[PDB]
């Protein structure tokens, strides 16, 4: 490895390189200025960001003596031997030229003494402390540390003299990811069709250890494609096929579509197949949502030139089975940002504060792997009018609602997290979460009109073969009050009658493809039992609430300056 | 056991096969393409799918050294010994030729660091992290893992360089089960009559060791039935019939659902009288998707899933549920009304989601939600705890029955007595498509019910039930059962009287017209006329909406 | 808060110990009604952990300690759930009501939010302020964001046309005329009257008070 291997974080690279090299190459400046350089480094960040790579690069770069100490490598069964090992390590490091000591995974060696209950760990921590800064402290020896959790470290170690400077090796940005792709695809035989800029744009939450995985599995896909039929020879490979090895763009697209960020590996949503062409009607809602989710991600330069932060939240309310969850699925399928899907009460727990912990964890993962789309289905479970729970379940629901409030709008870094909420009873949601800044636009998803119903039918029967003489306009006109679920039910009933006829005809033929498509009589018989899902009283409540929103909205229409 | 022994999962088998074999066989291709291969796998899935079997197969087939590590075997009590054990294992593996390491049940060793109280578990987690990733981490050493709870692992462990790809070794399909049967039944002597294809089609949720259990139980049944019949030549006449396999299949159930098994109750389609139209519609709705998926995929539509029976009490909805559970191939999951609820916070919803997860895992499955009046109710009650949990449960039901899931042939069967109190979002199509009303039987329906109830019992040759059927005009199947019970009780009382008289000094092997007449003079007509008015009003309102 | 027994109060003690150690310190307690609710309300509780937490807060903010200049700031929109003991003077003595903006305050807010945005030379905000009556700062922000969104849309379509063969150097009057037709008031009259009633009950606590001479 070398200095060019670590790419994506030049600032941290320079910050470490300063005290690692300059006081060793030319200390004349420090002797002129009169102050000694820092002699303590703590690299922290999410796993796979490049901490161990930075340590390896420093070891390869410096001509100084290097000493690596793994975390649990020091502990022994004998009482008083771990500290002896630490003492031997530090004395050996100090006896030689100005050396560097790298301590990997320091969360194991050095926990907080107050919270631990054993004795050997406390004694090891005290030995480390006195070795780092005590009488006769150190002699031109620099100590580097790497950790995934800095908060679980003894406060006495997070001090000047022991670990003065803490570098934050964080998630790369678009340019950093482009650098990582260039670094990791510089030694392989690539194809001519590769534009690394598109890949660096479409990859969002990859920590840099996932870029290597993506590249390697893409290469494996390419070799698999060129191996399956061209050369399946267990004995030996002819050289001709080796020279025709270029990892193509289709392979990279496949690799991107399969892989996901390592951070969100737990919360990967199982793939469902919904499409913008699969969602009929709701064209205005479709375009509005597409803009709200695409503009801040595709065009950050525009927002930065205009000096304003994008609108993020959005809530859907309306009668059930109108397309709210379907729109959520379509978004999760064909938006380019990561998706986090949670059901309503899915994050509740019997333990005290554990629901709050889960909410905090999911929103921290969402901002960490941003841009991210978090879908909150059925808000009425987790977010109700605070204080109205006179029957006390311990009041934990109020705490949940408060946590949601101050996690969507509080002391945060203003990262790109968009929240879509979906409910069919908006009146039971707290007013403090329907405010702009959390859920800005409140979109009513109304019952389909005639054209909407016709479009819904065309979308649902996009792939089913149909009779050439069939027309769905009469079906759309006949309903006048149905929903998308009801139209789906009609379609499924027509399918049911068609499959019944097909099966019985095939059975008769075998006893001694007659139906290649659904027919007019099939639709006529499936429409005999058609029913409306939503009554008028529920429709009356929804229209009344929407009219209340219009009263909150209708004061302006269009005004004159 | 070689690769031939492992079967039912081809994609995952190829995934592990290529990584473990091709780099050790022809590294020239990796040298040419200039990328190193992945060197880490975490096999996960439900218990008993064949993860350890595949590990054993690759170990026994590859020429590379294999080192086995068990989960708790490395842990100790002294400070700094478990990490020493791991270091010894890894260094021993790396000292020799390129090798494979297998950490069975890794979830025991390495839980999430932040959510543990001990210290040795944190040290050993950190030791695993440092061993797999670190300065000069590995060289021609491949690591494989096996676990049942992937989410309960340190996220720092689930990264490239430690466990590059997580292969999902899940349950097999119908064809996979076919190959599993063929593999397991390769050494035992079978009879010609039995065909494994029908058995594979009949089994739905059985995975691996479940099929092994089926085969072993069938063989044991054959041995037990022959061993008791008889007191060298016996060995020749050792053959397992189709009846043995049928017995084993009827007595068995998939492991994931074994705790949820229902006590066997014998009911058949002929045991339910009347309701022919509803019975046929239900049969169509149930066996159409499972027996003929080719037609459904040809037409490119999904099938209707949910059904709801409502009507007066006792008319036979739970009887239809029993009949389905007996006479459909799909697995059954019965649940009482409030059976899922709990006093704790956020547990009744966990209960609902676990049962639905198991159902959709062992698909196809029929979940019978009995007495929805309790679970569903109507969202938006009288504020406070009157609705606090009754709304969360309903929302969990809604989002589990429809939303953000993969369609996997799960049919919910409902049963209620006052459907007007059900939340309207539950009744929506796509959740509970069919709203079937099960009315009080008419004259011919009552005749059919009587004939069904009297199927297996002695009857007088000159006895007719038309008078009994016509002389009620307001009864229900429960009331007819009550009449039959009273008639049987009087007949058996007469039989006991005759037997006692004969002892003091079969007299009546059949029930008599006078027995029925004496029993019928005290009838019930349980369903009141107000309940009938309510049900008729609801049904005509539904028809008006229709 | 934590699932274990006593770890909530341990965390509170650690936070306040840090605050008084690195004094002078400012501690912001966001949504005080989440952790500091009136005691005894919970019929069924987790062993009375919330009561223990609020008692810990009470004793630490006023007990057998010193006054090392530590300033507690609370921000809650439901002052009815806060326990009376916390609101005592000497613990949280200043109750500041942040009402809805007036005409000049809406104008000030709009100018504050447009301080880094290019604007049309002839555009005046007095009309927008005069037209938003019941709005809040969040609502004015939403209006501004919608105007920015329409400006970006026009810029994007203009650039698309340019590539097919600054077009929008700054926001115009039209982006507000078209962006304020969907604006709405976040707080209804029910909550407004609830907060007014709360303010007036505190005023009624100040009974028989006027410009009086000693």
């Amino acid at each position: 490895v070398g200095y060019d291997d670590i790419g994506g974080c030049r600032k941290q690279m320079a910050q470490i390189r300063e005290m690692v090299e300059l006081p060793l190459r030319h200390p004349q400046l420090f002797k002129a200025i009169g102050i000694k350089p820092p002699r303590g480094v703590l690299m922290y960040g999410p796993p796979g960001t490049g901490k161990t790579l930075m340590a390896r690069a420093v070891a390869n770069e410096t001509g100084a003596f290097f000493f690596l100490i793994n975390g649990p490598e020091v502990m022994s069964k004998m009482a008083g031997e771990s500290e002896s090992n630490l003492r031997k390590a530090f004395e050996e490091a100090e006896k030689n030229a100005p050396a560097i000591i790298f301590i990997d995974e320091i969360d194991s060696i050095a926990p907080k003494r107050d919270k631990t209950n054993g004795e050997v760990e406390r004694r090891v921590v005290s030995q480390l402390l006195t070795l780092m800064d005590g009488m006769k402290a150190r002699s031109n020896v620099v100590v580097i540390a790497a950790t995934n959790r800095p908060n679980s470290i003894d406060p006495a170690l997070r001090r000047f003299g022991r670990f003065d400077r803490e570098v934050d090796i964080g998630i790369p940005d678009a340019t950093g990811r482009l650098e990582v792709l260039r670094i990791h695809t510089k030694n392989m035989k690539l194809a001519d069709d590769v534009d690394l800029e598109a890949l660096a744009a479409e990859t969002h939450g990859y920590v840099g250890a996932d870029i290597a995985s993506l590249c390697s599995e893409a290469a494996m896909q390419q070799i698999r494609e060129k191996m399956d039929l061209i050369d399946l020879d267990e004995d030996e490979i002819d050289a001709e096929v080796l020279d025709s090895l270029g990892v193509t763009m289709d392979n990279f697209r496949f690799a991107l579509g399969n892989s996901n960020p390592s951070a969100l590996r737990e919360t990967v949503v199982e793939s469902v197949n919904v499409t913008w062409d699969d969602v009929g009607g709701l064209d205005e809602i479709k375009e509005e949502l597409k803009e709200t989710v695409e503009y801040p991600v595709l065009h950050p330069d525009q927002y930065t030139k205009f000096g304003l932060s994008p609108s993020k939240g959005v809530l859907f309310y309306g009668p059930p089975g109108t397309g709210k969850t379907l729109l959520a699925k379509a978004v999760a399928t064909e938006v380019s940002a990561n998706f986090i899907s949670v059901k309503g009460p899915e994050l509740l727990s019997m333990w005290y504060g554990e629901s709050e912990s889960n909410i905090r964890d999911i929103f921290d993962k969402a901002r960490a792997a941003a841009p991210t789309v978090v879908f909150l289905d059925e808000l009425d479970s987790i977010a109700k009018a605070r204080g109205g729970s006179l029957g006390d379940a311990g009041g934990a629901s109020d705490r949940v609602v408060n946590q949601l409030l101050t996690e969507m709008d509080g002391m945060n870094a203003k990262k790109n997290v968009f929240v879509i909420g979906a409910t069919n009873r908006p009146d039971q949601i707290d007013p403090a979460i329907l405010r702009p800044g959390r859920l800005d636009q409140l979109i009513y998803v109304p019952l389909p009109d005639e054209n909407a119903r016709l479009s819904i039918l065309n979308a649902q029967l996009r792939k089913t073969p149909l009779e050439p003489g069939l027309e769905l306009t009469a079906i759309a006109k006949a309903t006048q009050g149905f929903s998308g679920a009801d139209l789906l039910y009609i379609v499924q009933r027509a399918a049911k009658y068609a499959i019944k006829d097909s099966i019985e005809a095939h059975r008769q033929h075998e006893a001694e493809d007659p139906v290649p498509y659904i027919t007019k009589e099939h639709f006529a018989e499936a429409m005999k039992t058609a029913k409306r899902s939503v009554s008028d009283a529920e429709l009356r409540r929804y229209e009344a609430y929407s009219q209340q929103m219009k009263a909150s909205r209708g004061q302006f229409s269009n005004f004159n300056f | 056991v070689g690769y031939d022994d492992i079967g039912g999962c081809r994609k995952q088998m190829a995934q592990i096969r290529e990584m473990v074999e091709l780099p050790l066989r022809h590294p020239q291709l990796f040298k040419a393409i200039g990328i190193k291969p992945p060197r880490g796998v975490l096999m996960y899935g439900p218990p008993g799918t064949g993860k350890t079997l595949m590990a054993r197969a690759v170990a026994n087939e590859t020429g590379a050294f294999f080192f086995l590590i068990n989960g708790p075997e490395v842990m100790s009590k002294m400070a700094g010994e478990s990490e020493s054990n791991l270091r010894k294992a890894f260094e021993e593996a790396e000292k020799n030729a390129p090798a494979i390491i297998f950490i069975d049940e890794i979830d025991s060793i390495a839980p999430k660091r932040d959510k543990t109280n001990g210290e040795v578990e944190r040290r050993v987690v950190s030791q695993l992290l440092t061993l797999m990733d670190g300065m000069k981490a590995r060289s021609n050493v491949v690591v494989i893992a096996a676990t049942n709870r992937p989410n309960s692992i340190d996220p720092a462990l689930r990264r490239f360089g430690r466990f590059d790809r997580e292969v999902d070794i899940g349950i097999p399909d119908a064809t996979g089960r076919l190959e599993v049967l063929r593999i397991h039944t390769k050494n035992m002597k079978l009879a010609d009559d039995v065909d494994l294809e029908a058995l594979a089609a009949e089994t739905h949720g059985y995975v691996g060791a479940d099929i092994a259990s089926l085969c072993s139980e069938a063989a044991m049944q054959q041995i037990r039935e022959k061993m008791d019949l008889i007191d060298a030549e016996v060995l020749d006449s050792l053959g397992v019939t189709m009846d043995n396999f049928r017995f084993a299949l009827g007595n068995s159930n998939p492991s994931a659902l074994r705790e949820t098994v229902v006590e066997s109750v014998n009911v058949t389609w002929d045991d339910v009288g009347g309701l022919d139209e509803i019975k046929e519609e239900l049969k169509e709705t149930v066996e159409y998707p499972v027996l003929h998926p080719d037609q459904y995929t040809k037409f490119g539509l999904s099938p209707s899933k949910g059904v709801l029976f409502y009507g007066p009490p006792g008319t036979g909805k739970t009887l239809l549920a029993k009949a389905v559970a007996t006479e459909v191939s799909a697995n059954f999951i019965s649940v009482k009304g409030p059976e899922l609820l709990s006093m704790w916070y956020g547990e009744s919803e966990s209960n609902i989601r676990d049962i639905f997860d198991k159902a959709r895992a062992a698909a196809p499955t029929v979940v019978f939600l009995d007495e929805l009046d309790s679970i569903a109710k109507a969202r938006g009650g009288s504020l406070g705890d009157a609705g606090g949990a009754s709304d969360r449960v309903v929302n969990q039901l809604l989002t589990e029955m429809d939303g953000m899931n993969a369609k996997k042939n799960v049919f919910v069967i409902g049963a209620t007595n006052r459907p007007d109190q059900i939340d309207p979002a539950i009744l929506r199509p796509g959740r509970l498509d069919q709203l079937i009303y099960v009315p009080l039987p008419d004259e011919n329906a009552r005749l059919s019910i009587l004939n069904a109830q009297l199927r297996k019992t002695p009857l007088e040759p000159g006895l007719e039930l038309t008078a009994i059927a016509k002389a009620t005009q307001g009864f229900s199947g429960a009331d007819l059962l009550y009449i039959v019970q009273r008639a049987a009780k009087y007949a058996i009382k007469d039989s006991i009287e005759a037997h006692r008289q004969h002892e003091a000094e079969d007299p009546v092997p059949y029930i008599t017209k006078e027995h029925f007449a004496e029993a019928m003079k005290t009838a019930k007509r349980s369903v009141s006329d107000a309940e009938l008015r309510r049900y008729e009003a609801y049904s005509q309102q539904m028809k008006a909406s229709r | 808060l934590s699932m274990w027994y006593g770890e909530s109060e341990s965390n509170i003690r650690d936070i306040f110990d840090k605050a008084r150690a690195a004094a002078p310190t400012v501690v912001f307690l966001d949504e005080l009604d989440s952790i500091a609710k009136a005691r005894g309300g919970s019929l069924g509780d987790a062993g009375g952990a919330s009561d223990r937490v609020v008692n810990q807060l009470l004793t630490e903010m006023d007990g057998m300690n010193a006054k090392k200049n530590v300033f507690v700031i609370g921000a809650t929109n439901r002052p009815d759930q806060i326990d009376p003991a916390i609101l005592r003077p000497g613990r949280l003595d200043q109750l500041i009501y942040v009402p809805l903006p007036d005409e000049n305050a809406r104008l000030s807010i709009l100018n504050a939010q447009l301080r880094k945005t290019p604007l049309e030379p002839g555009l005046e905000l007095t009309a927008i302020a005069k037209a938003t009556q019941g709005f809040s700062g969040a609502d004015l922000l939403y209006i501004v964001q919608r105007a920015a969104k329409y400006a970006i849309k026009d810029s994007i379509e203009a650039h698309r046309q340019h590539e097919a063969e600054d077009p929008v150097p700054y926001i115009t009057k039209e982006h507000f005329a078209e962006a304020m037709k969907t604006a709405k008031r976040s707080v209804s009259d029910a909550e407004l009257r609830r907060y007014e009633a709360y303010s007036q009950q505190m005023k009624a606590s100040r009974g028989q008070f006027s410009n009086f001479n000693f």
Binding site: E119, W351 | - | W4, Y5
Partner: peptide, 22 residues
């Protein structure tokens, strides 16, 4: 000569749960 050895295994903790009334 003899020798000593150190060992620190674990302890026992206490959790707190929340219940729902009706």
């Amino acid at each position: 000569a003899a020798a000593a050895a150190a060992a620190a295994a674990a302890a026992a903790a206490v959790a707190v749960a929340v219940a729902v009334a009706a």
